[PDB]
Design a protein around this ligand. Sequence first.
Ligand SMILES: Cc1cc2nc3c(=O)[nH]c(=O)nc-3n(C[C@H](O)[C@H](O)[C@H](O)COP(=O)(O)OP(=O)(O)OC[C@H]3O[C@@H](n4cnc5c(N)ncnc54)[C@H](O)[C@@H]3O)c2cc1C
Ligand SMILES: NC(=O)c1ccc[n+]([C@@H]2O[C@H](COP(=O)([O-])OP(=O)(O)OC[C@H]3O[C@@H](n4cnc5c(N)ncnc54)[C@H](OP(=O)(O)O)[C@@H]3O)[C@@H](O)[C@H]2O)c1
Length: 530
Amino acid sequence: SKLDGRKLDVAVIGAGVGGLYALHRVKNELGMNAQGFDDASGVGGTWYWNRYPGCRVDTESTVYTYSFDMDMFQNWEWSERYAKQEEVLGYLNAVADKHGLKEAINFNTRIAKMEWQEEARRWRLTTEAGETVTAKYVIEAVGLLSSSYAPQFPDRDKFKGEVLLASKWPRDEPDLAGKRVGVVGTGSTGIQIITSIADKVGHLHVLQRTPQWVVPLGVGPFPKETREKIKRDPEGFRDWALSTAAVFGFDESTVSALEVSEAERQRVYEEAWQKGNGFAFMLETFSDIPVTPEANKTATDFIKSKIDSIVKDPETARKLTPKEYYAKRPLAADHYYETYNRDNVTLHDVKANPIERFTENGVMVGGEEVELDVLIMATGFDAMTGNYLKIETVGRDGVRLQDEWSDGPHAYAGMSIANFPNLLMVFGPFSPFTSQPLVHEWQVKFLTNMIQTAEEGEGLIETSREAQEEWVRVCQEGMAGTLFEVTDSWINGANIPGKPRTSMWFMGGMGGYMEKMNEIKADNYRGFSI
Ligand SMILES: Cc1cc2nc3c(=O)[nH]c(=O)nc-3n(C[C@H](O)[C@H](O)[C@H](O)COP(=O)(O)OP(=O)(O)OC[C@H]3O[C@@H](n4cnc5c(N)ncnc54)[C@H](O)[C@@H]3O)c2cc1C
Ligand SMILES: NC(=O)c1ccc[n+]([C@@H]2O[C@H](COP(=O)([O-])OP(=O)(O)OC[C@H]3O[C@@H](n4cnc5c(N)ncnc54)[C@H](OP(=O)(O)O)[C@@H]3O)[C@@H](O)[C@H]2O)c1
């Protein structure tokens, strides 16, 4: 192998949003000998793999975009407000084409192991094919929502049909027309598939373990007026977006739902309902919706009244009504609840009627057979830690990341890990809960500036255990003051049997994150030893 034996300054793991910019920064902007690695055959990460029907971003294309190339930031002709998967993938390919990244990426190359060599001051990487690559620094951009999860029901051998994984959709597009199709899952992926295929399949069986509080997305044209605002001052727009908590293209509300009149609550929620977008409904309306049960109930009572008015069959309306708080990743899709009024859609509550096993012709659900041609798993991810822990990662004195993270992840600022020198993450665990591209850019700029500083001397970046544990503690405390603390979902690991259930996010928003990180940088990179 020509790769075998290669010696790099920087290895970038991943060629999604994070890895592409990380590689551009170290190779093109900083002039380092750097290459990327991805098990995918091309760039795009998320947008390369998730080719399922209806896949689309929930962040407006004004903010789900790079800003580092100011020409593309102001002039890329996004076709609509919320870009579909193919368009995002096309954009990432155009970025990689323009900046010569593909020639510096080793595609179809999975990193199986990385081991710190203290005397050599290098990381030794082993690919799945057994090739050895060394790098002074590793920038790990393997994604928080990249390790697919799907239950394996008994007797799959008996089933004559197809079982598809939405997050690793087949490269040859499946034929769904006229078929009996089951969808397992009603998170963001499931609701996109459901609304995309309901009028194409012969019959759609929605296998719903837990309904969530869906609001409209507001699919529509690209906001020309925001783009005019950007062109006055694209850096100012970028900086404004980063100053918000979620970086979703709006200012979060500072008004408590409980300090206004009932008429104002109704006005605000109706306005947000017509505007669309789940993050806006949860955060642009009032300030305390995911904080107190009383405020949360004003929002869910509103959504419940919509469900009841839309869904013709009352029992179906009740099955679509969650019992949990509105305290998961907020969901949005257009014409969602109306789907259940179709004569070819059946909703199954598979908490009350569990999926028991496969049969020859379908699936057993609460004691009755549901005949299926196709079963689509929209079941999410071993989130946050899944793909980090798939790389055997050996740090100082042989310490294994698998052991360090045995009770949950521990990391400093979502970018470094104590006992793993010169290993930097893009948007790792304990990052802020934000839209990702503009925040990836900010983090990449922060960590590559640390690399450049390290390269002026010894070339060693170590992170303090105490700083890491204090960062983790701040994230735990922030979660513990919200309803996310008492609402199980992938956000706290509860969706994976056996997985530690714990806080894994910084909860102060991007504005608060940057303030903390800038204070750390100003205090001679407190918690880092460079
Ligand atoms: C359906 C879906 C919709 C989403 N919508 C939004 C949205 O609207 N707004 C938003 O902000 N975020 C959204 N996200 C989050 C999305 O993950 C991020 O926006 C972003 O795409 C993540 O980029 P990344 O580079 O961090 O990781 P990824 O996109 O996951 O890319 C990581 C790449 O590295 C590969 N890789 C992993 N391990 C290895 C290894 N050992 N060796 C070699 N290669 C490896 C992976 O296979 C992958 O190709 C969505 C995610 C999904 C799945
Ligand atoms: N529109 C977008 O921008 C978009 C689209 C897709 C994904 N994403 C991102 O990716 C994240 C994950 O979304 P996702 O929908 O793929 O996954 P998800 O939010 O984890 O939802 C998974 C769904 O599958 C059900 N599920 C999991 N295991 C199951 C099992 N054994 N048996 C039956 N049902 C099971 C889950 O029910 P339970 O609730 O009972 O566990 C849930 O309804 C999103 O929250 C979001 O951050 C964004």
